[PDB]
Design an enzyme around this catalytic site. Structure first.
Site, mmCIF file in Angstrom:
data_model
loop_
_atom_site.group_PDB
_atom_site.id
_atom_site.type_symbol
_atom_site.label_atom_id
_atom_site.label_comp_id
_atom_site.label_asym_id
_atom_site.label_seq_id
_atom_site.Cartn_x
_atom_site.Cartn_y
_atom_site.Cartn_z
ATOM 1 C CG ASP A 726 -1.562 -1.362 1.459
ATOM 2 O OD1 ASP A 726 -0.846 -2.223 2.010
ATOM 3 O OD2 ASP A 726 -2.742 -1.579 1.121
ATOM 4 C CB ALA A 727 4.143 2.271 -0.756
#
Ligand SMILES: [Zn+2]
Ligand SMILES: [Zn+2]
Ligand SMILES: [Zn+2]
Lengths: 1098, 76, 48, 65, 66
Positions: A726-727
Site C-alpha cells: 500500500d505504497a
C-alpha cells in the site's frame, strides 16, 4: 409514467429550499419564540421576606447582537468581529417585572437579566435573510450554513444526543432475578423520574419509586393514591379473567393495608425512617406528589390519573408475563428521541435562571434588612433595578457552552467545530451521538437497526471505540418540532373518542395514546386512523402528527412530540402514485415548491412509528396494488460524506466506510475566508479540481464549488518494489508542475494582559538586561513596536511578538511568543485588536509551503490509502503507446482482498469522460452502467478492457503484458510527515517525576511502556533494560543507615551524615536508586507504612 | 478464492452473530418487504456480485454485515 | 513609536502609536481592528 | 484557484486555452470538437481543461493588505 | 395427565406447584440435556449438554478409559 430523473428533480428541491442544518435552526427558533417564556412562566415569581411585597414575572424578549465596549458605548456586533476579537456573539435578554405590594400590582419595570448566545443565521441573528453581496461585504462566505455558536472567539457546535423516548412504557426481561420489568422516564420541568413496576417469581407486583429505598407492593401504592376499594384496582388493571385472577391474588397477599392513611404512613416509615410522626407523613406525600409519574401532574388532585397509568403499566407487565406481547427492543427508532439544540439550551437556561432568582431574592432580602422600609418602598423601581446581577446567568451559560459540561452530568454536548474542508464542517453539523459509555462492548447498541433506513447513514461511522455509537443523519432526514399538545388533545376529543375515566378499556374497545399517555377508548381504530390520515393529507391539521395502530393489542398511537426522525415518501393510492408528470414540470419551472407538495397531500413525512403500517415500493415500475408509498430517491439514504464515493454499491462495506471517513481529512479550498480567518490550523490546496466521475448529489449540495482533490493519471503495475504494501510511486515532473502542492497556515496569538495593581505587560524589543532573554538573532525581524514584519522568513524558535512581563511572580520576565520549535514558514498577516477587557490582542499567522515528499499520505475515495514510497524522474517512467505518462503508480496486489471494483469502474469512467469532453454521472444506483462506459471507450479507439501497451522507461522496450491505466480522483490527506517527525536528545524534564516531558511541542520524549519492558525481558537483555529505563532518566544517590534502613539525613552544615530517627553515624552507606523509587518511599512514609531497607554488598 | 468468487459470482449470505438479519420492524428487516416473509432475499441473501452492482436493499444488508466485523475487531 | 496601520474594514492609512495609546480605533469608521501593512523592502523568493 | 499554465502530465502549455474552451462550449458547440480544434489530443491535457474550477474570482473579495 | 393436589384446589396455590411438578426430570442422569450420537471413524460416540462427570462413569455401557 414517472422515471427516477423526475423524482430526482422533485427531490433536489427539498435541499434547495430547506437546507442542510435545519434541525438546528428550527429548534433554536422555536426555543427563542416560546421556550424562554415557558420557563419564566414555570418559575412564576419572586417571594422575598419583605412584608406584603411580591414580584410577578411578565414577558421576556431578546434584543439584537450587541457588545458592551470597555468604553461606555454599546455597538452592534458582527460574527467576524466576534471571531477576531475573541468576543461572544450574544444578545441581551430583557425581562419585565411586575411588583406586587399589598396584593396590588404596579407599573412593570424593564430590566436586563443578562446575555444569551445567538446561533448564527437564525431568525434573531444579524446575518438572517441577507443577500450574497451583503454577506461578502460583511466578510462571510455565502456558502456558510450557520447553525453554530461563537464562544470566546471559538466556534462551538451542539451535537444531538440520542435519548430514550420520554413518558413511554418499555417492558424488558431480567432473567437473572426472573423479574419482568417495565420502565418509564417521566419528564416534568427538566426532572427525570425512573418509575418501574416489576413482577418477581412469586407473582406479586412491586413498584419502584425514586427516593424510596425499597420496592413497595403495587396495590399498596395504588391505595396510597386513593382508589382504596379492591374493585377499583381490579377495574383499572383491565378486564381479562386471568388478569383479574392475578390482581385478586395480589389483593389477598396485600390485605394488610386497606386505608389510604395506612399506606401513607407505611411509605412515611420507609422514606423517613426514625423521625417524628408528622415529618414522615409529609415526606411520603411529597414523594408521592413529585416522584411518582411527575409528568401526569404534581398537584395532589392528580392521584387518580397516576393510578390509572400505573394500572396500565402493571397490565403491560402481566401481559408480557403470559407471553401475549414480546420484549420491546430499545434500538427501534420509535422508542428513541433526539435532543436538539433547543431542548438542551432550554434545560441550561432553566438551571441558570434558578440561580438567578435565588440571587435576586437573597439580594433583595439583604438590602431590605440592612436599610429601612422608607428607603426601599420609596423607589421600588430603583430597588428592583439595582438588585440584579446578570453575570450570574451569563457566566453560567458561557462556561457551559464553552467547556461542554452540561449541568446534569452530561459531557461533550458541545464540541469545537471542524473546519478542515467543506465536507468535514457540513458533516460535523449533522452528527448524532449516543450517551452510552464507550469502554463497554454494547454489542446490541452498535449494530445497524433496520429502522435506520433513511434516517441514519449506514456507512459513515468512526473507526475506533466510537464505531456504531457516533452516527450521521441521512440526506433525506427531517427532525420535527413540537406543536401545542392541548390543541391536538381537543381535536382528538372532538373526533369521537370517549374520555378514559368514563369507561374501562374493554378488550372490545381500542386504547388511544397521545405522546405515550392513554387518553381514552374508541370502537373502530381503523376508521379513526383513516380519518386522521385524511385530515392530515388535506391540510386541516399540522404535518407533524403521526398515527400508527397495532392490530394485535388494539392500540392507537398518536405522536406530536419533539425530536422524531422522519423521511419523506410519495403517497400511493390504488396503485397509482399521486405525483404526476405535470407536477414534476411545475416543480422544474419554479411554479411549485416542496412545501406546496407537502401541503397538497402528495408527499408525507413518516416516522419510525407510522412506517410500521407502510409497505413501500422501491422503484416506480414496481408499484402494485398493496403498496402504500413510493421511495423518492434510494441514493439519498447515504450521509453527506458517503455520497462522495462514486459507484458505492460496487465496493466492500469496510472500504466504503474508510473512504467516507477519509473524505473529511483531505485538503482543499474549504472556505473562501481562509485569507482573513484566524484558525489554529488550516490547509489550502493550490489547484483543486472537480472530480471527473461524480455523483449528481454533490452538485446540488454545493461540494463542486469547493472541491478537495485532483484528478491523477493512474497506472497499475509493480515498479522496483517501492510501491509494495500500500505504497504509491509519484512522478517527479508532475510534482514540479504543481500537482498536490499545498500550503499550511497556523495562527499564533498574544495578549497584553493587565495584571491587578497597575502592573501590565508591554510590547517591545527585549533588551539583554531582562531575565530569560534568548539569543539576539531570535529578535531580528521585529519592528520597534514589538511586532514582526509581514512577509518575513521565520525558521523555528524565532520571536513573533516581543513581550515582557512584570517580575511579580527590579527585573522584567521575558514572555515573548515564538514559533513552534520544529516548524518554519513565512509571516502572512498581523492583526492588532482591542480585546473585550480593553487590553491589546495580536494575532499572527505563518504560512508554510508543503511540496509532496516521501511519507506524505494520499488516499482515494474508495478507501485505498498509502504514503509516497519513491519519487521517480519523468524519463524513468513508462509511457503508453499513445503517448501517456502515468502521474502515479499503484500496486496490483492492493485490488484483491480489498474488493473495490468501484475504483476500476471509476478509472474507466475518468478516461472515458476526458476523451468524450463531458463529465460522467456516478450516482449511487442510477449512474451510468459499466457496460455503456466500456462500449464508449471501445468506440473512441481504445481497448474495451481499458488496458494499453507501454514501454519500459529504462530498457526502452515494451513490456510483455499490456497494462491497465486510467484517470482516478485522489486526495491529499493532512497527515503529512513534516508534522509527525519528532526527535529528543536531552530536552527538559518534568517537576515531580523529572522524567522527559510529553508532546512534540515541548521537546518531549517517546513512551517506553510496560509492553516494551516485557519485550526487552523476553529478549533477555538486562543491561539494555537498565540503560533504557534508569540510566538516562531519574538517576539518584541516597544515604541510608545500616540498622534502621531509614533514609539517612546528610548535614551540609556539619559535613556529616546521620540518622534522625536512629541517631546513628557509625555506619552510613551510599546507594544508587531511581527518583521514582525515592518518591514512592516518601509516599509510603506519608501513610503509616514504614519500609525498612536491608542493605547488601555486591 | 473467496475474494474472486465474491467479486465475480455473488456475495452470498450476510449474517450477524451467526444468525440471519432479523433486527428491524416487526417481522421484517426493512419496510419494503411484507411482514412475516422468511425468503432468502428478505433476510440477507445477496444474489448480486461486486462487479454487477448491488440493489439498495442488498447494500443495506451488506453494511449491516460489515458493521459486525468492525465492532468485533474493536472489542477483540 | 509612530507606525502605519491599515484599517481592517475601510483599508485606510491610520498612523498612531500603540505603546502610549489607551483606546484603539480607526478615526474614520470607528473600527477596533487594524492590520500591519507589508514593508516596502524587496523580498526574494525562489521560483521552485 | 486559477487555470494551471501547463498540463501536469506531459507539460503542454494549456493556460491560454481555458477561456476560449469555456466560451465555445457555453455557446452550444460540442465539447469534443472544441477540444479537438484547440489541439489537445491526449486525454491527460483534456482532463485539466475539463475538470478545472475557477475559484480566483470568489476569493478576490477578501483582502488582507 | 391430570394433577390436582389438595393445595392446588384454592386459587393462590395452583400454578406454581403445577409448574414445579411439570419441571421434574425423569429417565435422565442429573444435569444432562440432549444426547447427540455420531460415528467417528468406525466408533460411535456420545455428546451431552450439561455435565456430570462423577456419575456418568458408573453408567453401564460407558467406557471409562476414554
Ligand atoms: Zn538508624
Ligand atoms: Zn476604518
Ligand atoms: Zn498533457
Amino acid at each position: 409514467d414517472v422515471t427516477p430523473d423526475d423524482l430526482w428533480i422533485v427531490m433536489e428541491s427539498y435541499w434547495q429550499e430547506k437546507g442542510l442544518v435545519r434541525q438546528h435552526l428550527d429548534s433554536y427558533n422555536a426555543f427563542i419564540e416560546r421556550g424562554l417564556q415557558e420557563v419564566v412562566n414555570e418559575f412564576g415569581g419572586i417571594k422575598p421576606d419583605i412584608p406584603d411585597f411580591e414580584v410577578k414575572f411578565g414577558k421576556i424578549r431578546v434584543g439584537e447582537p450587541e457588545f458592551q465596549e470597555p468604553h461606555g458605548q454599546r455597538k452592534p456586533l458582527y460574527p467576524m468581529d466576534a471571531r477576531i476579537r475573541n468576543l461572544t456573539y450574544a444578545a441581551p435578554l430583557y425581562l419585565e417585572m411586575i411588583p406586587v405590594i399589598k396584593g396590588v400590582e404596579q407599573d412593570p419595570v424593564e430590566v436586563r437579566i443578562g446575555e444569551l448566545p445567538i446561533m448564527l443565521k437564525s431568525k434573531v441573528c444579524r446575518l438572517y435573510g441577507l443577500s450574497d453581496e451583503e454577506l461578502i461585504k460583511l466578510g462571510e462566505d455565502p456558502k456558510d450554513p450557520g447553525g453554530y455558536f461563537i464562544i470566546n472567539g471559538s466556534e462551538r457546535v451542539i451535537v444531538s444526543i440520542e435519548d430514550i423516548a420520554p413518558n413511554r412504557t418499555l417492558v424488558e426481561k431480567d432473567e437473572r432475578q426472573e423479574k419482568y420489568i417495565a420502565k418509564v422516564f417521566s419528564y416534568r420541568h427538566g426532572y427525570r423520574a425512573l418509575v418501574a413496576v416489576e413482577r418477581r417469581k412469586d407473582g406479586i407486583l412491586y413498584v419502584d419509586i425514586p427516593n424510596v429505598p425499597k420496592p413497595v407492593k403495587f396495590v399498596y401504592v395504588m391505595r396510597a393514591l386513593g382508589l382504596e376499594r379492591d374493585k377499583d384496582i381490579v377495574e383499572a388493571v383491565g378486564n381479562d379473567p386471568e388478569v383479574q385472577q392475578i390482581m385478586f391474588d395480589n389483593l389477598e397477599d396485600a390485605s394488610d393495608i386497606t386505608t389510604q392513611q395506612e399506606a401513607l404512613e407505611f411509605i412515611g416509615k420507609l422514606v423517613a425512617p426514625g423521625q417524628a410522626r408528622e415529618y414522615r407523613l409529609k415526606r411520603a406525600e411529597y414523594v408521592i406528589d413529585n416522584n411518582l409519574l411527575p409528568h401526569m401532574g404534581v398537584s395532589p388532585e392528580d392521584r387518580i390519573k397516576k393510578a390509572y397509568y400505573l394500572g396500565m403499566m402493571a397490565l403491560k407487565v402481566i401481559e408480557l408475563s403470559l407471553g401475549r406481547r414480546p420484549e420491546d427492543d430499545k434500538d427501534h427508532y420509535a422508542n428513541k428521541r433526539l435532543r436538539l439544540a433547543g431542548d438542551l439550551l432550554k434545560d441550561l437556561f432553566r438551571v441558570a435562571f434558578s440561580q438567578l432568582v435565588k440571587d435576586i431574592q437573597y439580594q433583595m432580602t439583604k438590602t431590605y434588612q440592612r436599610k429601612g422600609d422608607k428607603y426601599t418602598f420609596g423607589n421600588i423601581h430603583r430597588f428592583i433595578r439595582n438588585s440584579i446581577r446578570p453575570d450570574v446567568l451569563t457566566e453560567r451559560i458561557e462556561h457551559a457552552l464553552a467547556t461542554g459540561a452540561w449541568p446534569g452530568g452530561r459531557t461533550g454536548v458541545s464540541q469545537l467545530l471542524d473546519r478542515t474542508n467543506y465536507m468535514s464542517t457540513l458533516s460535523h453539523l449533522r452528527r448524532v451521538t449516543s450517551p452510552l459509555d464507550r469502554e463497554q462492548p454494547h454489542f446490541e447498541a452498535r449494530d445497524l437497526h433496520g429502522t435506520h433506513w433513511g434516517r441514519i447513514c449506514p456507512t459513515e461511522t468512526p473507526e475506533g471505540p466510537n464505531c456504531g455509537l457516533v452516527k450521521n443523519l441521512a440526506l433525506m432526514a427531517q427532525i420535527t418540532t413540537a406543536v401545542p399538545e392541548e390543541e391536538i388533545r381537543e381535536y382528538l376529543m372532538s373526533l369521537g373518542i370517549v374520555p378514559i375515566e368514563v369507561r374501562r378499556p374493554d378488550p372490545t374497545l381500542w386504547r388511544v395514546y397521545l405522546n405515550g399517555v392513554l387518553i381514552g377508548t374508541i370502537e373502530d381504530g381503523k376508521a379513526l386512523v383513516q380519518r386522521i390520515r385524511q385530515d392530515r393529507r388535506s391540510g386541516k391539521i399540522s404535518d407533524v402528527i403521526n398515527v400508527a395502530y397495532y392490530e394485535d393489542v388494539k392500540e392507537v398511537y398518536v405522536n406530536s412530540d419533539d425530536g422524531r426522525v422522519r423521511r419523506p415518501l410519495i403517497i400511493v393510492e390504488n396503485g397509482v402514485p399521486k405525483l404526476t408528470k405535470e407536477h414534476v414540470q411545475a416543480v422544474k419551472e419554479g411554479r411549485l415548491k416542496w412545501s406546496d407538495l407537502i401541503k397538497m397531500g402528495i408527499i408525507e413525512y413518516l416516522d419510525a412509528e407510522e412506517e410500521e403500517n407502510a409497505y413501500v415500493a422501491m422503484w416506480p415500475w414496481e408499484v402494485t396494488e398493496e403498496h402504500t408509498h413510493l421511495e423518492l430517491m434510494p441514493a439519498a439514504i447515504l450521509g453527506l460524506p458517503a455520497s462522495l464515493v462514486p459507484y458505492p454499491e460496487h465496493n466492500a462495506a469496510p472500504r466504503n466506510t474508510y473512504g467516507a471517513g477519509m473524505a473529511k481529512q483531505s485538503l482543499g479550498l474549504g472556505w473562501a475566508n481562509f485569507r482573513i480567518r484566524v484558525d489554529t490550523r488550516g490547509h489550502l490546496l493550490h489547484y483543486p479540481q472537480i472530480p471527473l466521475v461524480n455523483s449528481r448529489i454533490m452538485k446540488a449540495v454545493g461540494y463542486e464549488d469547493r472541491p478537495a482533490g485532483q484528478n491523477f493519471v493512474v497506472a497499475v503495475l509493480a515498479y522496483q518494489g517501492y510501491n509494495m504494501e500500500d505504497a504509491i510511486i509519484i512522478n517527479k515532473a508532475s510534482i514540479e508542475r504543481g500537482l498536490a502542492r499545498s500550503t499550511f497556515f497556523r495562527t499564533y496569538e498574544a495578549e497584553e494582559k493587565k495584571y491587578l495593581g497597575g502592573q501590565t505587560d508591554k510590547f517591545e524589543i527585549p533588551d539583554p538586561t531582562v531575565r530569560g532573554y534568548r539569543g539576539e538573532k531570535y529578535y531580528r525581524n521585529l519592528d520597534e513596536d514589538g511586532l514582526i514584519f509581514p512577509e518575513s522568513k521565520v525558521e523555528g524558535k524565532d520571536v513573533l511578538v516581543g513581550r515582557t512581563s512584570p517580575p511579580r511572580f527590579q527585573e522584567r520576565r521575558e514572555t515573548s511568543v515564538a514559533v513552534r520549535p520544529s516548524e518554519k514558514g513565512v509571516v502572512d498577516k498581523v492583526i492588532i485588536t482591542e480585546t473585550g477587557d480593553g487590553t491589546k490582542l495580536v494575532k499572527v499567522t505563518v504560512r508554510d509551503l508543503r511540496i509532496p515528499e516521501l511519507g506524505d499520505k494520499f488516499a482515494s475515495r474508495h478507501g485505498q490509502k498509502g504514503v509516497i514510497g519513491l519519487i521517480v524522474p519523468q524519463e524513468d517512467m513508462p509511457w503508453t503507446e499513445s503517448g501517456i505518462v502515468p502521474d502515479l503508480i499503484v500496486n496490483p496486489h492492493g485490488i484483491p482482498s480489498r474488493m473495490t471494483v468501484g475504483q476500476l469502474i471509476e478509472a474507466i469512467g475518468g478516461k472515458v469522460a476526458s476523451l468524450k469532453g463531458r463529465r460522467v454521472d456516478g450516482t449511487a444506483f442510477i449512474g451510468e452502467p459499466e457496460e455503456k462506459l466500456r462500449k464508449e471507450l471501445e468506440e473512441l479507439g481504445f481497448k474495451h478492457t481499458g488496458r494499453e501497451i507501454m514501454y519500459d522507461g529504462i530498457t526502452g522496450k515494451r513490456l510483455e503484458a499490456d497494462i491497465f491505466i486510467g484517470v482516478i480522483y485522489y486526495q491529499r490527506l493532512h497527515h503529512m510527515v513534516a508534522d509527525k517527525i519528532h526527535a529528543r536528545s536531552r530536552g527538559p524534564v518534568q517537576v515531580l517525576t523529572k522524567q522527559p516531558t510529553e508532546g512534540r511541542a515541548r521537546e518531549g520524549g517517546l513512551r517506553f511502556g510496560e509492553m516494551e519492558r516485557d519485550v526487552l525481558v523476553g529478549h533477555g537483555a538486562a543491561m539494555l533494560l537498565i540503560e533504557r529505563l534508569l540510566e538516562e532518566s531519574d538517576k539518584t544517590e541516597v544515604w541510608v543507615c545500616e540498622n534502621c534502613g531509614h533514609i539517612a539525613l546528610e548535614d551540609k552544615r556539619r559535613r556529616r551524615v546521620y540518622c534522625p530517627v536512629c541517631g546513628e553515624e557509625e555506619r552510613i552507606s551510599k546507594v544508587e536508586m531511581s527518583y521514582a523509587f525515592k518518591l514512592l518511599l516518601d509516599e509510603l512514609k506519608a501513610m503509616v507504612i514504614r519500609p525498612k531497607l536491608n542493605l547488601s554488598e555486591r | 478464492i473467496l475474494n474472486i468468487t465474491q467479486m465475480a459470482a455473488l456475495l452470498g449470505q450476510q449474517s450477524i452473530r451467526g444468525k440471519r438479519l432479523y433486527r428491524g420492524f416487526r417481522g421484517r428487516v426493512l419496510s419494503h418487504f411484507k411482514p412475516g416473509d422468511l425468503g432468502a432475499r428478505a433476510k440477507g441473501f445477496v444474489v448480486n456480485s461486486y462487479k454487477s452492482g448491488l440493489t439498495p436493499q442488498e447494500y443495506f444488508f451488506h453494511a449491516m454485515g460489515g458493521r459486525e466485523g468492525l465492532v468485533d475487531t474493536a472489542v477483540r | 513609536v509612530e507606525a502605519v496601520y491599515r484599517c481592517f474594514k475601510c483599508g485606510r492609512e491610520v498612523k498612531l502609536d500603540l505603546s502610549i495609546t489607551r483606546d484603539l480605533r480607526c478615526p474614520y469608521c470607528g473600527s477596533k481592528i487594524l492590520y500591519k501593512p507589508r514593508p516596502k523592502v524587496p523580498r526574494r523568493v525562489k521560483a521552485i | 484557484m486559477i487555470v494551471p499554465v501547463r498540463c501536469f502530465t506531459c507539460g503542454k502549455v494549456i493556460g491560454d486555452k481555458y477561456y476560449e474552451f469555456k466560451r465555445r462550449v457555453e455557446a452550444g458547440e460540442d465539447p469534443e470538437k472544441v477540444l479537438d480544434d484547440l489541439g489537445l489530443e491526449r486525454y491527460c491535457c483534456r482532463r485539466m481543461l475539463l475538470s478545472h474550477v475557477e475559484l480566483i474570482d470568489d476569493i478576490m473579495h477578501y483582502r488582507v493588505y | 395427565l391430570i394433577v390436582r393436589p389438595k393445595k392446588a384446589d384454592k386459587i393462590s396455590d395452583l400454578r406454581r406447584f403445577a409448574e414445579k411438578i411439570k419441571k421434574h426430570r425423569l429417565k435422565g442422569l442429573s444435569g444432562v440435556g440432549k444426547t447427540i450420537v455420531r460415528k467417528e471413524g468406525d466408533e460411535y460416540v456420545i455428546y451431552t449438554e450439561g455435565s456430570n462427570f462423577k456419575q456418568v462413569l458408573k453408567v453401564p455401557g460407558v467406557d471409562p478409559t476414554r
